[PDB]
Structures are given as structure tokens and as C-alpha cells.
Design an enzyme around this catalytic site. Structure first.
Site, short mmCIF file in Angstrom:
data_model
loop_
_atom_site.label_atom_id
_atom_site.label_comp_id
_atom_site.label_asym_id
_atom_site.label_seq_id
_atom_site.Cartn_x
_atom_site.Cartn_y
_atom_site.Cartn_z
N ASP A 23 50.87 60.19 11.79
CA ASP A 23 49.88 60.86 10.95
C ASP A 23 48.96 59.86 10.26
O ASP A 23 48.72 59.97 9.06
CB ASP A 23 50.53 61.85 9.96
CG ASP A 23 49.60 62.93 9.40
OD1 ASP A 23 48.57 63.25 10.06
OD2 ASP A 23 49.90 63.48 8.31
N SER B 33 51.65 71.42 2.33
CA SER B 33 52.76 72.06 3.00
C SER B 33 54.06 71.24 2.85
O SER B 33 55.15 71.81 2.82
CB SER B 33 52.43 72.30 4.47
OG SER B 33 52.48 71.09 5.21
N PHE B 34 53.95 69.90 2.69
CA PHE B 34 55.09 69.01 2.51
C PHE B 34 55.84 69.28 1.20
O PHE B 34 57.07 69.25 1.18
CB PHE B 34 54.64 67.55 2.58
CG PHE B 34 53.73 67.11 1.45
CD1 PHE B 34 52.36 67.24 1.56
CD2 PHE B 34 54.25 66.51 0.32
CE1 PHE B 34 51.52 66.85 0.52
CE2 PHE B 34 53.41 66.16 -0.73
CZ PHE B 34 52.05 66.32 -0.62
N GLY C 262 49.36 65.43 -6.12
CA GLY C 262 49.23 65.85 -4.73
C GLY C 262 50.05 67.07 -4.43
O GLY C 262 51.13 67.25 -4.99
N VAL D 72 53.55 65.69 -4.84
CA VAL D 72 53.66 64.32 -5.28
C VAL D 72 53.27 64.27 -6.77
O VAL D 72 52.21 64.78 -7.15
CB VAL D 72 52.82 63.35 -4.47
CG1 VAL D 72 53.10 61.93 -4.91
CG2 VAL D 72 53.09 63.50 -2.99
N1 LIG Z 1 44.43 62.34 -4.81
C1 LIG Z 1 45.24 61.54 -4.78
C2 LIG Z 1 46.29 60.55 -4.75
C3 LIG Z 1 45.98 59.20 -4.72
C4 LIG Z 1 46.99 58.26 -4.74
C5 LIG Z 1 48.32 58.65 -4.78
N2 LIG Z 1 49.32 57.67 -4.88
C6 LIG Z 1 50.52 57.54 -4.23
N3 LIG Z 1 51.22 56.46 -4.60
C7 LIG Z 1 52.40 56.30 -4.00
C8 LIG Z 1 52.89 57.17 -3.06
C9 LIG Z 1 52.09 58.25 -2.74
C10 LIG Z 1 52.57 59.24 -1.71
O1 LIG Z 1 53.66 59.09 -1.17
N4 LIG Z 1 51.73 60.27 -1.44
C11 LIG Z 1 51.95 61.25 -0.44
C12 LIG Z 1 53.18 61.40 0.20
N5 LIG Z 1 53.44 62.31 1.14
C13 LIG Z 1 52.44 63.13 1.47
C14 LIG Z 1 51.18 63.08 0.92
C15 LIG Z 1 50.91 62.12 -0.06
C16 LIG Z 1 49.54 62.05 -0.62
C17 LIG Z 1 48.97 63.16 -1.26
C18 LIG Z 1 47.68 63.10 -1.75
C19 LIG Z 1 46.93 61.94 -1.61
C20 LIG Z 1 47.48 60.85 -0.99
C21 LIG Z 1 48.77 60.90 -0.49
N6 LIG Z 1 50.89 58.46 -3.32
C22 LIG Z 1 48.63 60.00 -4.79
C23 LIG Z 1 47.63 60.95 -4.77
#
Ligand SMILES: N#Cc1ccc(Nc2nccc(C(=O)Nc3cnccc3-c3ccccc3)n2)cc1
EC number: 2.7.11.26
Length: 347
Positions: A146, A31-32, A28, A35
Site C-alpha cells: 500500500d 476502515s482500518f 486519523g 490513529v
Molecule cells: N492527517 C494526518 C496525519 C499525519 C501524520 C500522522 N502521524 C503518524 N505518526 C506515526 C504513525 C502514524 C500511523 O501509523 N498512521 C497510520 C497508520 N495506519 C493507517 C493509517 C495511518 C495514517 C492516517 C492518516 C494519515 C497518515 C497515516 N501516523 C498521522 C496522521
């Protein structure tokens, strides 16, 4: 490639430990920050690492909130650590969270692209778990700010939903103003569209109602690239907001003229096979008056979720449903009598 850090556990006392991880890949961006996905060397468990730029003037608010949360429908902060990164002379905060493989956005997109809707059993499971996570965070005065499908993580095998991304989350204090520019396009409560700075946690309930309607429809209920387009879509379903309703969501907008649309019947907005309980739940979440919307806990107790309370219910894959009834005193505090409905006799 093995990376070893000295990370502080999220919960418990501040006693750091050596954490080693490998197989780091980006999952992921935005702007944050970034990930990542990684595997812990000791257990072999997958984790997500949210890396954000750290403000020198004060402690990261998302980290302060995450360290105090403990709920089965909220992604768990395992560890946190500071590090270097892309920008030199800048310190980064790394949040080591439990990894969840899917999102409601990706799953719903599969169904919409295949010209189908997500089975109502999954609409119930996911929506119920979202309302539990909201009931829990709202019991501390914390508003997510959000709520959207990309922030709803999903484990498809167990049907567990976990709320994630607490980057905009804030403890709302009455009389202290809040920025109105939070919340993503399609999911913004009408008080946020009118730029109100005195809003309540009920903005999350409007967002959750938008997610429910989108899962029932296969497409967003109030689309548009501007607030005026979003507002016309809202007025088409809800009818014209009265002067009183407008006063309740930003009183500085009472003198403006709004298109005169009669209160459309909610039964006509969804496909004919849509469960009337889901429609009734929508009409109670998507209301102009912020105080008229159901609370998260009242929504958990809605008849749309009765199937979840049946002792014989099972997932389509044959497995048992995930934990749904392990409510705590903290979680029920907005309305303790609801435990009569929320915890069924077999639980
Ligand atoms: N594609 C995709 C995809 C699918 C599953 C995950 N799994 C996962 N597992 C634990 C924690 C987090 C998390 O804190 N993400 C985020 C935190 N902060 C901001 C944005 C995001 C985020 C960014 C992209 C998508 C969804 C969330 N994400 C990650 C990416």
C-alpha cells in the site's frame, strides 16, 4: 486526563511495563480503525496510537511484522497493548508508535495548491529514504502492498521520511496466492489491475515510481476511478503492453484487445525543467515486466541520488541531511557490491 496501561515493548523480550499518557486527540480515521496522538507522561515525547479491532482466531499480522522491524525510515513500534473500545465485547489492539507530524500527501498538496513543485532536493531525500525502507522490508520477503503519499510520514525540520501503515503488509511466499485487491487507486501495479494473485514485492516499486512521478508533475501520473481508465493512462505513457509483457503480469488476460498507442518518449511527459536523471529513474521503475523494474537498493544507487552523496550537501534550512548511509548487512543482502556506491568515502 492521564491514561495508564500495561504495555508490552515492541522490540526486546516480552516484559510489560506501566505506560502513562495524556493529551489524546484523533489524527486519523478509516476502515482500518483510528490513529490517535498522545504525549508520554515520563518523557513528554509524542506518540501515535493505532487502534484496530483484534481478530479472536489469530494474532494480528501487522503487529507480528512491526515487532521484527528496526530501520530509521520505518515508523518504530514502541509498545503494544490490548483494550476495550467502541464495540462492546470486542478486544482492540493498540500500537504505540513514534509520532511523525507530516505526510508526503499533505506536503505535496501544499505545493500543488500553490501552483508549484516540491524542490528536487526534497524529491531526492524523500524518494531515497522510501527506497531504503523498501530495501529493508523486501530483504525479509515482506511486501508493504500500500505504498502511497499518505503512508509516507515526514518530519519537515529534519527531512526524515518514515514508512507507516503495515495493515496490508505481507511476507510473500512463491507459490502461495495473495489477494489482488490491495493497493490504492493511482498506485496499483498493472499486474494488480489485471487481478494477478502471483505478484512479487516489485508491486511496491511500481507504487514508488508513481509517487516519484507525482512529486515531479504536481499531480498523479496514472489517474482514474476505474482500472480501465488507469490502464489507458498507463498505455499512453508506456505504450501498448506486448503479449509477452501481458503474460508476465497475469497470463489469463493475453487474448484481450488493447488500444494501440506508440511508446511515448518519457522526456515529453514531464515539465521541461525536470532533471533527466529523475526521468531515467521513472522509466526504470514504471515498467510492465515486474522483473525489469529496479530493485529498491538498485534505485538507491541511481545517479538521481548522487547529490545526496556529496559531502557538502545541506538541507535548505541550513541543517545537516538526516542519516542516509548507515546501511546494515541485512539491508545490502540483495546486492552487497552496491555498498561501493551507497556508502560514499566521507560517510
Ligand atoms: N492527517 C494526518 C496525519 C499525519 C501524520 C500522522 N502521524 C503518524 N505518526 C506515526 C504513525 C502514524 C500511523 O501509523 N498512521 C497510520 C497508520 N495506519 C493507517 C493509517 C495511518 C495514517 C492516517 C492518516 C494519515 C497518515 C497515516 N501516523 C498521522 C496522521
Amino acid at each position: 486526563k492521564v491514561t495508564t496501561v500495561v504495555a508490552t515493548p515492541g522490540q526486546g523480550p516480552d516484559r510489560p511495563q506501566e505506560v502513562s499518557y495524556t493529551d489524546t486527540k484523533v489524527i486519523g480515521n478509516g476502515s482500518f480503525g483510528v490513529v490517535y496522538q498522545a504525549k508520554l507522561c515520563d518523557s513528554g515525547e509524542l506518540v501515535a496510537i493505532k487502534k484496530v479491532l483484534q481478530d479472536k482466531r489469530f494474532k494480528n499480522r501487522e503487529l507480528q511484522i512491526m515487532r521484527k522491524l528496526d530501520h530509521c525510515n520505518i515508523v518504530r513500534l514502541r509498545y503494544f497493548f490490548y483494550s476495550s473500545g467502541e464495540k462492546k465485547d470486542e478486544v482492540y489492539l493498540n500500537l504505540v508508535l513514534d509520532y511523525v507530524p507530516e505526510t508526503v500527501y499533505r506536503v505535496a498538496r501544499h505545493y500543488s495548491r500553490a501552483k508549484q513543485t516540491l524542490p528536487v532536493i526534497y524529491v531526492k531525500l524523500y524518494m531515497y529514504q522510501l527506497f531504503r525502507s523498501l530495501a529493508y522490508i523486501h530483504s525479509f520477503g515482506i511486501c508493504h502492498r500500500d505504498i502511497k503519499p499518505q503512508n509516507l510520514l515526514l518530519d519537515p525540520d529534519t527531512a526524515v521520511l518514515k514508512l507507516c501503515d503495515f495493515g496490508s503488509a505481507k511476507q510473500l511466499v512463491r507459490g502461495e496466492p495473495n489477494v489482488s485487491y490491495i493497493c490504492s487507486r493511482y498506485y496499483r501495479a498493472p499486474e494488480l489491475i489485471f487481478g494477478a494473485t502471483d505478484y512479487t514485492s516489485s508491486i511496491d516499486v511500481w507504487s514508488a515510481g508513481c509517487v516519484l512521478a507525482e512529486l515531479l508533475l504536481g499531480q498523479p501520473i496514472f489517474p482514474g476511478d476505474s482500472g480501465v481508465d488507469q490502464l489507458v493512462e498507463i498505455i499512453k505513457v508506456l505504450g501498448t503492453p506486448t503479449r509477452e509483457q501481458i503474460r508476465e503480469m497475469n497470463p489469463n488476460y493475453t487474448e484481450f484487445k488493447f488500444p494501440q498507442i506508440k511508446a511515448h518518449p518519457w522526456t515529453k511527459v514531464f515539465r521541461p525543467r525536470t532533471p533527466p536523471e529523475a526521468i531515467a529513474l521513472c522509466s526504470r521503475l514504471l515498467e510492465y515486466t515486474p522483473t525489469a523494474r529496479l530493485t529498491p537498493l538498485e534505485a538507491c544507487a541511481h545517479s538521481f541520488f548522487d547529490e545526496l552523496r556529496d559531502p557538502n550537501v545541506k538541507l535548505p534550512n541550513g541543517r545537516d541531511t538526516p542519516a542516509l548511509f548507515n546501511f546494515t548487512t541485512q539491508e545490502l543482502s540483495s546486492n552487497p557490491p552496491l555498498a561501493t556506491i551507497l556508502i560514499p568515502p566521507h560517510a
